Amino acid sequence: MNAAEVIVYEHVNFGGKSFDATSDQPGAGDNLNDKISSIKVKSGTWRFYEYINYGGRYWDLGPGEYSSVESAGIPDNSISSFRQI
Template identity: 40%
Template sequence: MSNINNQTQDLYSIDAVQDLSHETAAAVSGGAALEVYDDSDFSNLLLQTNDGTPYVGDDANDRISSIVVNEGLWRFYTDPQFQGDFADLGPGLYPNIGLGINDSITSFERIG
């Protein structure tokens, strides 16, 4: 709840906020095109980026379990340097990626 000019109003009752999609909100706020999380259901953010990476780093390697793709088409690989098995994900929320790559992602790149 906010109290602006002595008027109490629930933030979600404001149409402009309520009607923004996740993708639009990220674009407006200058947010990242991609977010990866350690656990299912978007818990424990590991990385936010607009760029691919040939190696996710020791802190994220083989730990990614959920993903938010705010824009673009991304390819996720099981090996460094964009090698190994892969899965492609477009804009959306992926609370439990499965796809044979859960806890196996080592590199990723934007492909579209």
């Protein structure tokens, strides 16, 4: 009775953590710079933002995979959070 798989990385492929879980965790939480990240998930829409839940860079997207490093804002991976719908 499980139909949800959200796997994302909070860093480079060969240098990041693999977060594989359904809707329940607080997105992401780690102190570091907003470097290259690997986001590959297919389930509705998700809101990505590197800051609080009421004062940060809002950026949502549909089911798709990507891994940029100069087109997603590289300020600082602090107080980052993302919820999947």
